[PDB]
Symmetry: C3
């Protein structure tokens, strides 16, 4: 097996990876997906820490380790500080995947931990998703040079992670969100700065027709309610809006979905959709990531 | 290893199995029990879903997988619908054992899931138990042709599952329950219909002496309270009642028991009892079931 | 591998071990620590039972099993009595580690269980800790003959376990605790009785300078509050107090710590400290223990 050397212990936002690093990861995920499960992490253990329990993440991670000959250790966020607990894990274990709300907390755990820490999802960031998404796209295009991804919806953590992800690999990305719901300046900013070096064109705006125009890929996600709903109704993915993209676009969604909200069934269940392939690749992307991180011994 | 081909993805009530299928399973469970643990499910994963946490079931399942080289994944019923969650599991995993209260829910999960689903126990059904019970009986008799099982007690889910189980294998079964506590028409009905084809004699009635008469096996289980208790007092298993069965009967109980309620200690701890052997076979029956289901790939 | 034969099924207080038994264990832990992880418990399963969830214990145990080719099964203390549950575990499993509050409960589980039971920690006892501590000391001294350990602080369960532990191996130990907070007569008593046969000198008193005098090792641990705090302030480990020990003493603490309470940072983070080495050895001591217990088949 030709395992990738990452020059980082942790993976938190996506930004601690070089561009080459990200491809190597992707290319490796794909090789693993094709190849019969190697016990590359014999007896290694991944701690799994949760704020609110999240199935999709937990299972995809635990699965991966198990398939790599490892073990996943389910811990809870019913806790001594998140410093003390980092110290401890390190003695007895090989890595940690945390999902919690405050990203600052994760950063802290990483500094203090002496084993790899992986952000399962914080409020601000969701690297692993984006990484599975890039994998999915690359499976289709075999390249990011010259590719447009439109994301329309709420300016959320998966949005952030896509921005950084696209910037890193020189994939162009435009975002359309309603007036209130733009993503964070600080991130947009970082993303733009990465892009200066990869020639990726990143943009944020409001009219979605503009985002989707000539896009190779469209991505949405789920959204007191009375007034909000009426504001996002125009940001729905449908026969009508998707006509402005390329004939040959594919649809992405991180799931789960509420049909006839963010996306019409016609689209999500149509042949343009590849949400399922996407879903699967969570497993594999992560596996690739895990193995690289764990061989920095 | 000579693994049984089941013509079904799921196992919910017992009724999706042919009679041959059930023996093959039993015969296989026994072979496995005798034979040093094969890693027949290397790296496969069984999701374990719980409504209220139940030890006996959870452990017997997890154990089995572990002994088969697999892994059990404990999930909770602190959950998005039970549709969404089925879809997800299927991507990352190989099978699901669910215990929940509403059987309808399980049915749903099975339809929607694209991997095997096993009913750990619903309010109406408890297949796995019955299957371990048949195994136990067969260990003793080596045949169901001509065998009578009496169940006295409450007309509960394990009762149901025994009815169907006995009907399928042509084992005769009579049930005695107090006036209020007969089992469900719909099941009795199905059971009777199966029996028409296997020549099993099934009956439901009230006087327990009648149920136990010439029985090869007696089976009870645990039972506002002030008036109920006085009604079941006569449905106790004891020196007195067991005299009407065959000299050579054996006693079963799925456990746990309240001695000097449903059963006197004399009986349950007497040499006629085989509740322990029963208990053990949970493990093995299940193992057999799991392996067959998982090789329908 | 040269595995130790223990003449006991369970390990609850430390007192069911002979002195030889304890060394053999220690010596084995060390060998295991040095040697690449043997799959000595292939497919064996350790049940893990919790009263309040405790990370350090849970992880160190689960880890160990995993590294020994086993599996740890996390159960909860959301439970039928702790008799019924012992019976059950035994059918499907190989051993149990319990942490609960009432030691009496553990005793009970052990009697009733027909597989090994290990006290993770009760209010009165914490064997596994002490055992990791002895390992740590022995790593340094290679012998207990002639060695003094001072424990100052609250007369707590780890204190108890140290008393018994030291008594068993003929290590001298003095304890200094404030007036209210002496450890239990009944234990001191047992400990003294063991010591009569190993020549260990055990003592309990109040002035800590006396405890630490000419000590080879110093051990503290964490401690309505307004009046208590002022009482223990003098029982702090610091530059000042540690001068009365040997030049060449080492500091122990079971962690976690509150610096500038029981111990000044100067000490705990100083080169005299070996709290980390201590921490690690939890894993290994336990592994050694587990393997010996599990080969009493």
């Amino acid at each position: 097996v030709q395992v990738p050397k990452l020059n980082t212990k942790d993976l938190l936002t996506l930004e601690e990876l070089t561009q080459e690093e990200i491809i190597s990861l992707i290319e490796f995920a794909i090789y693993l997906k094709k190849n019969k499960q190697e016990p590359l992490l014999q007896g290694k253990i991944l701690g799994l820490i949760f704020d609110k329990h999240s199935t999709r993440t937990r299972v995809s991670f635990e699965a991966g380790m198990v398939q790599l000959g490892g073990h996943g250790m389910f811990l809870n966020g019913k806790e001594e500080t998140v410093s003390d607990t980092a110290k401890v894990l390190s003695h007895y274990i090989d890595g940690i995947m945390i999902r919690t709300f405050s990203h600052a907390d994760v950063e802290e755990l990483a500094k203090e931990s002496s084993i790899p820490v992986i952000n399962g999802l914080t409020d601000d960031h969701h690297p692993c998703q984006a990484l599975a998404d890039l994998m999915t796209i690359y499976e289709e295009t075999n390249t990011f040079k010259g590719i447009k991804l439109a994301y329309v919806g709420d300016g959320n953590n998966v949005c952030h992670s896509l921005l950084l992800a696209s910037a890193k690999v020189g994939m162009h990305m435009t975002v359309a969100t309603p007036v209130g719901y733009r993503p964070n300046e600080e991130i947009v900013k970082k993303a733009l700065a990465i892009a200066k070096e990869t020639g990726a064109e990143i943009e944020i705006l409001h009219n979605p027709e503009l985002a989707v125009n000539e896009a190779d890929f469209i991505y949405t996600d789920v959204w007191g309610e009375e007034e909000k709903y009426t504001l996002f109704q125009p940001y729905q993915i449908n026969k009508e809006l998707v006509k402005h993209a390329k004939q040959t676009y594919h649809f992405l969604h991180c799931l789960p979905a509420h049909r006839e909200e963010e996306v019409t069934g016609e689209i999500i269940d149509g042949p343009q959709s590849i949400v399922f392939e996407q879903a699967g690749n969570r497993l594999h992307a992560q596996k690739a990531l895990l193995v690289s991180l764990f061989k920095n011994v």
